[PDB]
Paper text:
In the cryo-EM reconstruction of streptavidin, fine details were obtained after a routine 2D classification process (inset). From the dataset we were able to obtain a 3D reconstruction of streptavidin at a resolution of 2.2 Å. Furthermore, we were able to identify the water molecules from the high-resolution EM map. All of the side chains of the amino acid residues were clearly assigned. For phenylalanine or tryptophan, the benzene at their side chains appeared as a ring-like density with an obvious hole in the center. The 2.2 Å cryo-EM reconstruction of streptavidin indicates that the UFG support can improve cryo-EM imaging quality and that it has the potential to facilitate the determination of atomic-resolution reconstruction of small-molecular-weight biomolecules via standard data processing.
Here we found that the uniformity of thin ice relies on the surface flatness of the supporting film, and developed a method to use ultraflat graphene (UFG) as the support for cryo-EM specimen preparation to achieve better control of vitreous ice thickness. To verify the imaging quality enabled by UFG support, we prepared cryo-EM specimens using 64 kDa hemoglobin, 67 kDa α-fetoprotein and 52 kDa streptavidin applied to the UFG and collected cryo-EM datasets for single-particle 3D reconstruction.
Residue numbers in the entry:
A (entry chain D), B (entry chain B), C (entry chain C), D (entry chain A): 16 to 134
Amino acid sequence: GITGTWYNQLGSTFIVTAGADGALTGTYESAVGNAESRYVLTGRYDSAPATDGSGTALGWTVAWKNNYRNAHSATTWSGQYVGGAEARINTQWLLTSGTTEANAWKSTLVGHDTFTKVK
Amino acid sequence: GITGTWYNQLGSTFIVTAGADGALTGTYESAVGNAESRYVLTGRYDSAPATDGSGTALGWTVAWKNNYRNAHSATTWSGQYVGGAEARINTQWLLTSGTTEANAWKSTLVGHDTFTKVK
Amino acid sequence: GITGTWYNQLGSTFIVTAGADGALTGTYESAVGNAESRYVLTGRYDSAPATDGSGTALGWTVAWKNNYRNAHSATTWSGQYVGGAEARINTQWLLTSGTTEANAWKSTLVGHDTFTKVK
Amino acid sequence: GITGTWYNQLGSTFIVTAGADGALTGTYESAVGNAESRYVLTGRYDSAPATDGSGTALGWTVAWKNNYRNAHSATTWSGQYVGGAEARINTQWLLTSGTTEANAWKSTLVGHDTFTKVK
C-alpha cells in the first residue's frame, strides 16, 4: 500500500510508485521546496520488511530543479511506512543548500513531515 | 567531477554515476549499513549549480537490503559536492529503522560523513 | 507564559521555571529518557523575543542520571515557544549516548516533540 | 578533564566548568552564533560515566542574547566527551530560530562540531 498519492501536514503532494526491485519513483509539489511546480523524486525502500508488525523503512531525495526553477538545494526524507487502517509515512528530512565554504555551517535544515493518503 | 569512486572517513566506498538529467546511481559497501556487501543507491543532484563558487547540493538513499542481508533500515545522505583541487562531498545523514509504534521515538539515527576521492 | 508544566505527545511532563536572566530550570520525567524518575533540566531562552509575532527560541538539556538510574546519555531539545490561545513548544531533539569510538557513528538519535500545557 | 577551555574546528571558544552535581556552566564566543561577543551557556553531563571505555555524554544550550546583541535563536549541542591523550568533545547541534508559523519548517539548522583543548 506504499504506492499511491500522499499528502503531508502542510499541503505537499507526494505521488510515488514503489517497484519490486526496491526502487521508488515519482513527483513532488507544493512548498517546502518551492510554491507551485513538480519535481522528480527517486529513492529506495526495503521490499521485504519484517512481519512482526513494524514500519517499512524508506527514503527518497528531491533535488529542487525542474524546467521552471532551480533553488540549488536538495531534500532527503528518511522514515518508515506504517501500514494499517489509515496508512502513514512518518519522516525526518534534511534540506541542504549549495553554499560557499564560509557558509557551510548553515547549509543544512532539519525537520519532520508525516504523510497520509487523504486530503 | 561528481561521477567516480568516493571514500568516507570510516572506510565506506561510494561508487556513483551522475547523469545529465540529475539522476544519481551506484553502489555502497562497507559498514554503517553492514559489514561486507554491496547495496544499490539512488538519488538526485542539481545538474546546473551556481557559478559563484558554491557546493553542488545532492542527496541519495540506500535501503540496506540485497540478496545477502536485510537490516530493515534505510540511510539517506544529504550534502553538497565541493569541487576544487581535492574533491569533497560533505554530508549529513539519517538512518531510519523499521520499528513498532512504541519504539518509533528511537527509530532515527543522525550523523555526518565526509567523502574524498582518495583512499 | 513559558513558565509552567508542559506535556508532550507521548506522556512526558516538563515542569519548567523561566528566569528574567534567560535561565531555564526544572525537572523532566516519563520516558524517552527512562520510565518513572525525575531528572534535572537546565537550559536557556531569549528573554526579549521579537514582537512581530514569532516563537520564543529556547533550548534545554537533560542528562539522564539521578540517584536512581544512569543511562549514560543526554538529550538536548531545541525549539521555539509559540504563544497564543493554546500555548505550544515545538522542539527537535538530539539524544547522545556515551559510546566507544567504534560505535560513535550510532551514538546520536534524533526526533521531535511538541509540548502543550494540557493533559 | 571536562572542565576547561575548548576550541572547535571553526574558531569558537568554549570555556566550561563542570560541577559534581552534573551541572555545566560557562561562556561561548566566536561565530556560528555571532561574530564577537560572549554568551552564557548552561547544560548537563552525566557525572558517573561507564568505565568500559566510553564517552561521557553531555549537552548544553546557548541562547544567542547578551547585552550587545539578540539573534532570537538558540543552539543546543549534544555529544560525548572522549577522554585520552588528546581530549575531545564530538557534538551534533541544532540551531532553532524564532519564526512565524508559516516559516516554522525552516526554523531549525543542524550541523556538527568537534572540540579540542588546543588552539
